[PDB]
């Protein structure tokens, strides 16, 4: 039905959790990245970080913890999935040659259990004594970390509490001791509880209930001396220990929330933090001696050290290094001085690493007009947010990127060629009187204009200002910037001509966005023209709903205002005027066309293929796939065959069943193809990366459609001929039995689609992950996959398979990106 | 104050998919943007009794007016009818004079749903009941029956897809209470009858291609339910005993106003529901896993199969509503606020502008229906999405 | 700033010659010593068990 073929062009780069330890062995301190289904390990050295492995995983890694319990000369590393793959690591050496077993795996899924949303939570104890998971509400996963069983039976306590914010493992307990910050109607608590593993129960905990500030959301366990517990909220930071209750509300952390700590000493009387808007803070525990020795808190003390990117995770390394991962801009390796700098700032940048992350649109481009695809993504968020170019060569073939920093949040792209020039909406936030937190792009433009339409809050609250701004394409320099009215969000950006008029211009759909309304009630459908480096409104037109996305379809343009999907004319007196209306839907989020059918993707309905009937001058549902998804981005394959990616990491492919013999069978799409990416895809574009010579005609692929995902991964979709799409299918099979997998996950189970309401194998896709790396597996290994395999040799009969034929033939696979 | 509109939502999560198992939620919030804010009253409505859509909300269930035959329709979806309605800025469709009112009224039906099947599985005098269906794992097949005297019971299950009568087994003594699914019972392809006047439970497996195979045949039962594969939960007059059907073996009873069986039903009603198990990832709403649930339930068995539907407005942990309606006619309309900030959202009103009144939700989609049942007079309404544009 | 001396020290050459991977492809089947299964049967009847005790 459907043969795709699903590669990856750029792995995932967002910084998702970094741990330290000595997993390699007792001497080395390594650091350990996950970066979604990858798992990166670094041995700190002299140089900096020496990257020793590199592990791919089936699955999305949500936790990460490195242990080393008793008997153990190094430490152990605990990984769970989010299919719940749970995986004990243990890192070999032999010399030369390193094997990365796998003391334990299992899968601990509960079927039934409502995900919580503060999400999977995986503790472990300090003394190594069990792994606690906090999955679902009301259940705590305990496993044992016992050695003579032989099987690891983890069983769950139920938590009387529902909500929980933050949990972790108290030190200086006899027993395992855990503490945890709850929501309940009267507000927010913490509580403790300690782990009976014989009863499997809970037991009251040492020290008792707290009532705590209406926005606490991080614990933190103090190691010994100190014990006890730091809850970090929004406005004040407090420990409790027993009746031992300190509490600090320093003014310079109220500007925004902390999300990420780390402890620096090992007696933890210093702590890192990071907050949303990229500052990081040191946290100082004052210690006091008592007469008989014991040492007891004294007091809490915050300092501000400067800025750094927004950090979704902090570890110290060593000698004041500290690695700042991060997940909306490029992760950082920063140094902490003793002395501020000429800025007043104590923390110093040393080395960055590149993070596309978030790639919220994207365009391909023949920039130089050497006949090969660029890539012009809009990367970032807040203070990240920036253009990354992309593109495939030599500085073998890799990528490269290069970055032009925005500083305020990109939402859309287009290109002008006419103009030579780009189209970006961005946003920036400001501080209600409103006054712009940080220079920008959008404000230090050559030239820039204010929305003059006269078609159409408390003091402190932040208010978002977009801007259309005009990039030359050269220098990457913004010529102008457009702010828009007050109150108002660009939203969907195209760049086309229109009707008869041969005047390119940039069209913007906007909306009017208030706190108090669910949905835009209002917005414009503004066209201008970007001529003599000044930007002017050719055009504008009030529309009762938020533009959600525009093209270009046969010399008109197609809307979708709310639930509406909208046909105007370019009239003569440069104005538009609506042609047709289709109204059937709940949100039309997304379009596509293709001569004259329209895909629509919506927010949960799936797909629907529609078509403009030009002598009638209306619409027509073709058909629709009557599956629910939350869609976040649709493209048409070919006439017959709609891909989809929705909400839960999967992609599908829909057909045109025109092999269907009534009417209304032929109002459905059959949904032929089923895969889980494990990445959520924000953008999908046709091209390719590569050079489309006339000798590459050998190629056994037709089609080629880029996606851009959130984790900062680009990958390439394709088609594949019937048998080639057979022959690949059977390579799957024998390497899903000539490779075993890092913690023992089935590739099938890996790929399997999996949402809110079904799941079912992997179909009509080939991972060519998997495919390609049967070219680095050993001879003997090639043999043991092509033998007594029967391949095609191109003369028109099966034979014998040998390594060289699927060496090639795989070989030619990879010429694709 | 909270950015409540939905492209702050939705710019949110282009940036940022949220914490590792979080997804589910970035898109169960939506349901508080997007809502049945509109409701057309008094739908012409065909000779036949609705009943419930399916658990994956493809098709609807309606019985003949013979009471012999099962009728099912597709689901066209909530947006089936936006095109009929424009131009009618408003919250709700009054009933009027004017021919557009009545044209609308006399084509919606038909708009949201459409015939496939019209299957004639009952014979030899026998009626199907109004009040029993139960739904497959895989949501393939459907589960009827047909009928203190005594009469022949059968039992039927019916492929939606396909329409075709898969396998039926038949009692010729028997007095099973097939309303509201009482007598039987359905987990994870177990399926359960329960023969009160033979004092009989009975246990099949169901393929997933359709068919009947025998498990086993096992103070007075009153009512059945099923913990798991291992374990009964039956009743007695009272009485409540949890027992093992492959040991034979007595697990625990339970007196009716026993404390510790009410904090263990406070524990584990979630598990004792059994929301969605049509799915490996569920969210269900009970007072066993919600803050707001557990606080009516203390400010204030078994479980019938299938009882509870999995629809997201319903769920406490997104909106604010009265309990008394929904989980005689409602007084007043049933107003449905955020809980995040308290807003009024939308109305739901079964009324004409005592009455039996029932509310129908879709499992997912912003659609819902409302119907009035009095001796011999039926009114339905339809709550929908609803935009001007 | 005075509590910024003393940050910890691991090895004092690290980082000191600092200048502004190979992925694992397993073959070798190596049985895994333990699997981590969990309770099959739910939380409510394993407590009724344990409470039969």
Same mark, same amino acid.
């Given at each position: 039905q459907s043969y795709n073929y699903v590669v990856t062009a750029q792995k995932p780069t967002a910084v998702n959790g970094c741990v330290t330890g000595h997993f390699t062995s007792a001497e080395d301190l390594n650091l350990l990245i996950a970066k979604n289904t990858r798992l990166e390990i670094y041995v700190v050295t002299a140089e900096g970080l020496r990257p020793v492995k590199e592990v791919g995983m089936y699955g999305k890694i949500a936790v990460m913890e490195l242990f080393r319990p008793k008997g153990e000369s190094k430490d152990l590393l605990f990984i769970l999935t989010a299919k719940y793959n749970a995986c004990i690591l243990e890192y070999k050496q032999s010399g030369e040659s390193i094997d990365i077993i796998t003391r334990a795996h299992g899968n601990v899924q509960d079927r039934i259990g409502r995900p919580s949303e503060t999400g999977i939570i995986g503790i472990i104890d300090p003394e190594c004594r069990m792994i606690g998971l906090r999955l679902y509400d009301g259940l705590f996963k305990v496993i044992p970390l016992d050695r003579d069983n032989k099987e690891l039976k983890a069983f769950n306590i139920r938590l009387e509490e529902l909500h929980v914010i933050d949990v972790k493992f108290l030190y200086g307990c006899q027993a395992p001791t855990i503490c945890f910050v709850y929501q309940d109607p009267q507000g927010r608590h913490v509580k403790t509880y300690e782990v009976s593993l014989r009863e499997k129960e809970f037991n009251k905990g040492p020290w008792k209930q707290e009532n705590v500030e209406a926005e606490a959301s991080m614990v933190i366990a103090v190691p010994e001396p100190f014990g006890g517990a730091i809850i970090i909220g929004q406005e004040s930071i407090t420990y409790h220990n027993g009746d031992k209750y300190l509490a600090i509300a320093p003014p310079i952390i109220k500007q925004s929330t902390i999300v990420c700590h780390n402890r620096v000493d090992p007696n933890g009387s210093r702590y890192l933090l990071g907050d949303m808007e990229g500052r990081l803070f040191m946290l100082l525990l004052e210690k006091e001696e008592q007469m008989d020795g014991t040492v007891t808190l004294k007091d809490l003390r915050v300092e501000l050290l400067g800025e750094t990117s927004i950090a979704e995770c902090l570890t110290y390394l060593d000698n004041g290094v500290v690695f700042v991962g991060s997940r909306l801009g490029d992760s950082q390796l920063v140094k902490l001085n003793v002395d501020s700098n000429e800025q007043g700032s104590y923390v110093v940048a040393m080395e960055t690493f590149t993070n596309l992350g978030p790639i919220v649109d994207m365009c391909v481009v023949d920039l130089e007009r050497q006949g090969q695809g660029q890539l012009v993504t809009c990367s970032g968020a807040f203070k990240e947010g920036s253009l990354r170019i992309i593109r495939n060569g030599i500085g073998i073939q890799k990528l490269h990127i290069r970055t032009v920093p925005l500083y305020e949040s990109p939402r859309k792209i287009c290109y002008q060629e006419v103009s030579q020039c780009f189209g970006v909406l961005s946003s920036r936030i400001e501080v209600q009187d409103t006054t712009a937190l940080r220079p920008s792009a959008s404000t230090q433009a050559l030239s820039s204009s204010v929305s003059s339409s006269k078609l159409f809050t408390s003091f402190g609250e932040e208010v978002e200002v977009h801007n259309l701004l005009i990039i030359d394409?050269? *220098?990457?320099?913004?010529?102008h910037a457009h702010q828009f009215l007050q109150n108002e969000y660009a939203l969907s950006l195209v760049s086309c001509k229109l009707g008869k008029d041969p005047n390119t211009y940039f069209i913007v759909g906007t909306a009017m966005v208030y706190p108090e309304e669910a949905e835009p009630k209002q917005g414009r459908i503004v066209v201008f023209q970007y001529s003599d480096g000044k930007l002017q409104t050719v055009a504008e037109k009030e529309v009762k709903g938020a533009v959600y996305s525009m093209v270009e379809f046969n010399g008109k343009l197609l809307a979708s205002i709310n639930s509406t999907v909208r046909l105007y004319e370019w009239t003569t007196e440069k104005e538009l005027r609506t042609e047709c209306n289709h109204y059937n839907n709940i949100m039309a989020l997304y379009l596509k066309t293709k001569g004259d059918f329209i895909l629509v993707g919506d927010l949960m309905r799936s797909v629907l293929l529609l078509a403009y009937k030009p002598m009638e001058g209306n619409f027509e549902e073709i058909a629709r796939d009557f599956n629910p998804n939350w869609m976040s981005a649709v493209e048409i394959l070919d006439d017959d065959n709609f891909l989809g990616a929705e909400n839960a990491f999967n992609l599908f492919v829909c057909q045109k069943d025109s092999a269907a013999t009534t009417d209304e069978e032929r109002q459905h799409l059959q949904e032929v193809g089923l895969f889980h990416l494990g990445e959520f895809v924000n953008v999908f574009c046709h091209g390719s990366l590569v050079m489309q010579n006339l000798?590459? *005609?050998? *190629?056994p692929t037709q089609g080629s459609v880029l996606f851009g995902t959130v984790n900062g991964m680009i990958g390439l979709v394709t088609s594949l001929s019937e048998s080639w799409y057979n022959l690949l299918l059977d390579m799957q099979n024998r390497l899903n039995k000539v490779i075993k997998s890092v913690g023992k996950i089935e590739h099938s189970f890996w790929r399997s689609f999996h949402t809110e309401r079904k799941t079912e194998p992997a179909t009509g896709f080939i991972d060519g992950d998997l495919i390609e790396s049967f070219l680095d597996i050993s001879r003997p290994k090639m043999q043991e996959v092509v033998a007594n395999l029967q391949y095609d040799?191109?003369?028109g009969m099966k034979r014998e398979a040998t390594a060289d034929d699927l060496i090639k033939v795989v070989e030619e696979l990879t010429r694709i990106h | 104050i909270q950015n409540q509109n939905v492209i702050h939502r939705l710019e949110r999560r282009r940036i940022s998919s949220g914490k590792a198992g979080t997804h589910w939620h970035q898109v169960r919030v939506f349901h508080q943007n997007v809502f049945p804010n509109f409701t057309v009253v008094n739908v012409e409505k065909p000779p036949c009794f609705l009943r419930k859509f399916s658990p994956d909300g493809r098709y609807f269930i309606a019985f003949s007016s013979d009471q012999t035959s099962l009728e099912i329709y597709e689901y066209q979806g909530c947006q089936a009818a936006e095109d009929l309605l424009q131009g009618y800025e408003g919250e709700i469709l009054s009933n009027g004079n004017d021919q557009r009112s009545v044209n609308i009224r006399g084509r919606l039906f038909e708009r949201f749903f459409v015939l496939l099947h019209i299957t004639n599985v009952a014979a030899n005098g026998e009626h199907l009941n109004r009040e029993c269906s139960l739904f497959t794992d895989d949501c393939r097949c459907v589960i009827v029956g047909s009928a203190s005297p005594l009469e022949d019971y059968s039992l039927h299950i019916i492929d939606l897809h396909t329409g075709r009568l898969c396998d039926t087994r038949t009692f010729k003594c028997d007095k099973v209470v097939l309303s509201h699914n009482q007598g039987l019972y359905l987990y994870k392809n177990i399926l359960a009858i329960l023969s009160v006047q033979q004092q009989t439970i009975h246990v099949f497996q169901v393929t997933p291609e359709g068919t009947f195979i025998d498990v086993r045949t096992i103070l007075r039962m009153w009512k059945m339910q099923l913990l798991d594969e291992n374990h009964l939960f039956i009743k007695y007059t009272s009485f409540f005993v949890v027992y093992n059907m492959v040991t034979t073996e007595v697990i625990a009873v339970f007196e009716n106003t026993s404390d510790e069986l009410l904090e263990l039903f406070e524990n584990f009603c979630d598990l004792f529901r059994?929301?969605?198990?049509?799915?490996?990832v569920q969210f269900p709403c009970s007072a066993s896993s919600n803050n707001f649930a557990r606080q009516i339930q203390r400010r204030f068995l078994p479980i019938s199969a299938q009882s509870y539907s999995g629809s997201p407005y319903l769920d406490l942990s997104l909106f604010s509503y009265?309990?008394?309606?929904?989980?005689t006619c409602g007084d007043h309309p049933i107003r449905f606020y955020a809980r995040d900030s308290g807003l009024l959202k939308f109305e739901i009103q079964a009324g004409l502008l005592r009455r039996l009144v029932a509310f129908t939700f879709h499992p997912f989609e912003p659609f819902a229906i409302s119907v009035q049942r009095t001796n011999a007079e039926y009114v339905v309404n339809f709550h929908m999405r609803h935009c001007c544009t | 700033a005075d509590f910024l001396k003393g940050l910890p020290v691991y090895n004092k050459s690290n980082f000191s010659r600092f200048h502004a991977p190979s992925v694992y492809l397993p073959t070798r089947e190596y049985p895994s010593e333990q699997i981590i299964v *969990?309770?099959?049967?739910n939380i409510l009847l394993r407590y009724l068990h344990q409470q039969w005790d």
């Open positions: 394409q050269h *220098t990457f320099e913004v010529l000798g590459e *005609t050998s *190629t040799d191109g003369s | 059994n929301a969605t198990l049509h799915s490996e009265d309990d008394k309606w929904v989980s | *969990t309770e099959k049967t």
